[PDB]
Symmetry: D2
Subunit: 333 residues, 4 copies
């Protein structure tokens, strides 16, 4: 039997501090999307959250770097609770929190909210993919940035969802490399929509959104990678032709690394060189990072991904130092 959002909000109401951090980070990201600030948004952290203890530890380490590089980078943790699978498989902490096929969704929603509240309380803003239609009412108040995934960017129900979110949103190119669907999606999500959604009390209702003015695209590769200067330039052209923001984000992982976590640093190096040359159209980067590198089928090892493989903490330190130094030069130019 499904508890409504108000039951979770009652137990875990947003704090003054978390509320402030969310508000501020959304504004800061909006400034990047619209070219008002030349800091680099960095969406970085696990492919998926499957353990809160490891997540909190990761966050504590990330926070020290968030502060250290705050003049160059705007660091925000990946806190992904919903995973789109190719066919079937574990869909994330919300859907199956005990990792055993019990689908204890009430527990999963409580735990997702609790983790997000602790993260924001310690000073670390959070990001997630918004995949499911009804779950956002449980946690979206704690989210500073949202993704719509490659598999759902062309979906009208996701563009509707995005049009009503209060955080900035990045739309990914399609899994085969189609960018136009993401440009289209900004067009769609920036407008007003009417559609059915569920209230905080757990009731279906008609909602009328105002449109989301803070949307941008994400280059995450296709049949070929799309992270280099030539692809970025092509994309900026099309963005301008559609009359939407020509500031974009580049995912170092997924199809840009060819699913090989060791190649994320390669992509980051290319981005660093672009930032040093010019890189005027880059407002952000995405990175799949955990305490420990690689991946595992069963959750045996602490801080090691059970979905896409990630770089470990050591490489994370290097990647962030690399991007901070490069962007410091861009910002000084």
């Amino acid at each position: 039997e499904l508890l409504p959002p108000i039951a979770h909000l009652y137990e875990l109401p947003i704090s003054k501090e978390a509320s402030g951090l969310v508000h501020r980070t959304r504004q800061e990201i909006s400034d990047l999307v619209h070219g008002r600030d030349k800091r680099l948004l960095v969406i970085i952290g696990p492919c998926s959250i499957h353990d809160p203890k490891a997540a909190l530890e990761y966050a504590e380490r990330l926070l020290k770097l968030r502060k250290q590089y705050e003049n160059e980078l705007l660091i925000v943790m990946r806190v992904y609770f919903e995973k789109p699978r190719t066919t079937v498989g574990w869909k994330g902490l919300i859907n199956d929190p005990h990792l055993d096929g019990t689908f204890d969704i009430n527990f999963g929603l409580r735990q997702a909210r609790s983790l997000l509240l602790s993260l924001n309380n310690m000073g670390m803003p959070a990001s997630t993919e918004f995949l499911d239609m009804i779950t956002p009412q449980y946690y979206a108040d704690l989210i500073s940035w949202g993704a719509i995934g490659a598999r759902t960017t062309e979906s009208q129900v996701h563009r509707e969802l995005a049009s009503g979110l209060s955080c900035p949103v990045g739309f990914k190119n399609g899994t085969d490399g189609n960018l136009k669907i993401a440009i289209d999606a900004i067009g769609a999500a920036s407008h007003s929509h009417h559609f059915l959604s569920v209230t905080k009390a757990g009731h279906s209702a008609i909602v009328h959104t105002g449109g989301n003015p803070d949307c941008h695209v994400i280059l995450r590769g296709g049949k070929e990678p799309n992270y280099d200067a030539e692809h970025v330039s092509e994309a900026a052209e099309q963005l301008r032709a559609a009359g939407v923001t020509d500031k974009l984000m580049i995912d170092c992982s997924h199809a840009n690394s060819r699913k090989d976590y060791t190649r994320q640093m390669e992509v980051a190096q290319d981005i660093a060189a672009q930032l040093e040359q010019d890189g005027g159209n880059i407002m952000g980067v995405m990175v799949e990072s955990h305490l420990v590198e690689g991946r595992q089928d069963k959750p045996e090892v602490y801080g090691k991904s059970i979905t896409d493989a990630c770089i470990g903490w050591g490489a994370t330190e290097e990647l962030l130092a690399l991007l901070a130094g490069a962007n410091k030069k861009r910002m000084a130019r």
Copy 2:
């Protein structure tokens, strides 16, 4: 704004014994085609979108006569699409904006969609639609004999979840650039059990556990290039078999297979007819965008003329159906 729950609509428009029987029977018949147990050709045919119930009922009456006439060769089911996925923005269909004026009277739209579907089934004409929205199906799905998941949503996990709990057979379209694998993947996904959030007949969110949908198949609807010919059908059947799913598929004559030109649908149908006459063992169905009047219009001025994708008119519809019936009659007679 104040959304009525499905039970309010079910109270005013409860399913009849006859409509319930027609739906049950047609779903079974279509399942038999999906699994190669019958060699009749499923034909999903009708308007791109429903925007007028009067014209829809008139179209249905004409179609019914041909449904009966060709019932040994073709299993004809009307396109009764209430939900339209747009490229960017635009009219999303009768449910979202029934008065066609930007008033978004969704309660009226749901009532009217249900009423039309009940009348169609009561006159003997089964209905099909694209299932796009997550919450609307509880209002009408009991009256639907076949569902589409669109090219733009086939790769979407929430649509595969939805499909996994529907009681009707479901066709998954290849992606707008031509990717077939996402539709094969989608059958894999939708045929399994899922747990997810959905809304009850009382209008309350709830956890649902579906049993998986065993009646799913792919639809070839074109990409950067058309994919309707024998070479593409054969390639697709191979992949289907490699994934261990049904290698019987449907071919859309419209959208990217006609290159968005309604006058080319007949071309595609002719190619399918020739395939059915040579062999065509992997074809179980075809889709066609048809209305009383051909073409399209921005405003709903002309009666029975599409306000979304352009359609063939009634005359060409008669020819197209006769062409497919004759061709499939030969297939069904062949040893």
Copy 3:
């Protein structure tokens, strides 16, 4: 499965005319409760509604008398949908509309609302006993006056309900004759309350009422009748002592007639004589009247009560003429 009030409001929205009639009649009745007009409120009609056809016919006849006597009497029809039984039995049209133990409550609510909308549209305002806690959301917008019954006047949940109704409300003395519980009830219902109630969407909620300033008592007999001058005078004294309105209503039926419908006219005569001597504390009277007199266990005869016995239409004409003539004299003096 229970439809929420919004489903019924969607099918049967209140009209401009019915809205106006309700608003006006509530104001008019308030004027009587607070001694600003000396017309006599007359709550008259069947013990219970069991047939809408007969109800509409009765209403059409009553309307003619409502117009005729409008300078002396303010006539409002008894349209009672909810009946409190001594032990068990038929609870009214809402609970069991088909009169067969099928309890088709959705149909009953729809039919109760439809009838009330037609009555108001033809110019006849309606009254009912408010017995059930959740049903009022379905029809209260069409009610000009409400009763809380003898069996429920001492009940805190009914006093809460009354405190939030937008129509004037009469509280009946207890079945053994206790008047204090009704005086207490005005005290209670005139104040603000917080309690649980159900919304128009069918969801439980906390409500905060403002108190009902239009409440008054009804004398309906006990072990003995309480309709005479001596009892009216005693009651007015106690009313003043409790600092509440000393204008009251007298029921000609139930324990004041000793459950004998032929004695209602006796009571009405006594009231008429009071109105002619003085009768300053009387603002209303209640009468159980139908097309045909008496009662019946099965609904075999048209327009004949299946609950308490009623006077027939001929005696109804006489009773109303008697009260109109008596009050015309009161008003002139």
Copy 4:
């Protein structure tokens, strides 16, 4: 915004032990109602719960006596959360838990449920008056016996409620002494009913109850006390005439003590003498008892009532010893 029962059941699910205690105690009480066991049910404790700490302390003391007298008495604590007032006033812990007019009903429901869970977990079954229509879904699973108050026994909505409760229920005579309304109420509540109620998910619904076969009357005084042998005998006769159980309960407080807490022991003495002569029609007694005697308008003193005045702990020990000794003799016959 009102949380639904499932939110509270999620945080405070019933335990194996509490569930067992509730189940056993209901059965044991049923056996007393139907004359299958001659132990005396004793409903004893505060007029109202306003403090959980004091309530838990009281319960710990009462538990020791519950064990000590378990062969003679079946002791169950008064854990009343809902109070019917004469006009206006504090309605109990649920309605206004902070005792300040803030009406924090969500907090009140949570706290009521938490207290009941702790009481049952320590071995002490609980009783309450069921006054409100929607609150029972939050706690009734933890209640071993329920009262319908003197002010609501004649109310059809309370008789409906009772008909669907899973615990035995006592109906009180009316505030002026009318017993027939309580006999009528057993008749009503023992039958099946259809009516509107709210589900564990907080939605209104139609419910079909099976009737409550475990109902009985409670003599709690009227204009005069009704606790003596004469009154008990008169009541048993009427009970038998109505074909319902002629085993009844006697309230030592309220109108039987003439609202004087010191007189409760007097009433208990009379009952003891009855149990020693014969007393075959007595199955229970009710007593208003707290840690400290008397009452207070403000909650200044610990363990002292803020509603009706109670006897203190010392007199409680004497009263219970008196009833145990008397009933031990009855049981031995």
